[PDB]
Amino acid sequence: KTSFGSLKDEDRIFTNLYGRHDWRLKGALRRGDWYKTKEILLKGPDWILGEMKTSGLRGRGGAGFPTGLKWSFMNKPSDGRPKYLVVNADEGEPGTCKDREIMRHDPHKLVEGCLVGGRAMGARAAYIYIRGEFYNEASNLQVAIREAYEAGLIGKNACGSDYDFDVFVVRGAGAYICGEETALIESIEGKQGKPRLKPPFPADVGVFGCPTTVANVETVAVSPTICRRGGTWFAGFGRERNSGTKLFNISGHVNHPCTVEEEMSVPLKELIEKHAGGVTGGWDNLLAVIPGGSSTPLIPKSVCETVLMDFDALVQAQTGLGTAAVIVMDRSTDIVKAIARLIEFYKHESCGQCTPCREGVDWMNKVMARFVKGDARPAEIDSLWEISKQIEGHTICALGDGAAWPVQGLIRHFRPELEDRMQRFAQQHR
Amino acid sequence: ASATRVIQKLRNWASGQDLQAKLQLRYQEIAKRTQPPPKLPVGPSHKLSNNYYCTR
Ligand SMILES: Cc1cc2nc3c(=O)[nH]c(=O)nc-3n(C[C@H](O)[C@H](O)[C@H](O)COP(=O)(O)O)c2cc1C
């Protein structure tokens, strides 16, 4: 199929996204969950990993790495140490709400995916590191986990199989950087949320020094339905190498900001006009869009006209598909102030380990504040571009890249706006 | 500069050359000792961009 979108409700993988249909275990069994899971576990780890590889599911964390290959990193025999699955329920990126929605409205999908992924890797426990601000979501997840333990779906007989698994929930304490892979591992281990270098990879040294695999909530939540319904089906959705369904959050200046499940490779304009009710004032009033959450740069209306919603499509459009969090800005907004607020966010949420990210993102925050006021000079635009290029690729984790990229997008597209602000400031202060 | 016409004529004739045009005592044509403040220019490599030290 050349065109994508208009996903069928019977093909929606995240039924009960809107809080109906009794999120507890009885409603999960009515909607279809924990079905043939014993058959899946007895079918075994190699079959599950081959199912993931044939489905072609990619990380849904924003990373974009092939889930099947990443999970098949740990198909080794035993070492002496246990193995762990870790789920990232931190969801700290601006624009992103999908993990919160699925944890509070269909948590048994997350629990079943923890069990299936833990069996696929070969493991004894899944630590769900949830965000600290999601107290009600964490309590609902604990209610679901207690119901699964009472039903015998976890612990000493995984759904009647001879596999032993445990599911723990550990809450954060308010750090966006703890959504990172190794920083989350450190936060579980009880230190500060500072990411560690790679190598060693988490598949060799993770939490407590054990082989671990860190996976997104949406990834593990679509995992057991991928195993159950094939994977050729999941690859049938979406384009080549960008396959399946995706939870798009749409926020900002849209008529109905909402979280909706939609097929991959759907047009941005089609997605907004079909699910968000359109831009406030119209598609002509649309100025810019951030398609990923906050780590991805801007795309203006001109390229937003025809862009698709793939990793490859946004890479071609000099952006990325991160958490699929379409932030929409119409013409009646301060785009420089929005980008400066994003740099404020990255300055406040930097963990402070690397000198590049630490000092450079503080520097970016000050330069962007002066850009918003107008008291800069047009040479400082290229100076800020070089500061961004110095930050990017020179840090331990990708928060430095995710702070450099919105600056690069703003400089790339809305440079006459910055120059206009500077000349207006200069002529009004002289 | 403060010499009579007869003495100037005698000096010019004795020297063979005109002396009042190029006399070796400085009176007023020199610069004032108090000068306005300068504003010295910055040279190249003050560019704030495309100015890595490894390229120069
Ligand atoms: C600063 C930073 C914040 C991140 N926050 C999250 C987050 O909130 N949730 C998430 O699932 N991944 C987050 N990630 C990306 C993780 O590296 C990625 O999700 C993790 O490797 C799980 O892989 P997956 O996408 O294949 O499931 C973040 C990365 C960085 C650098």
Ligand code: SF4
């Ligand atoms: S890039 Fe920033 S947030 Fe990431 S490890 Fe370095 S100092 Fe910490």
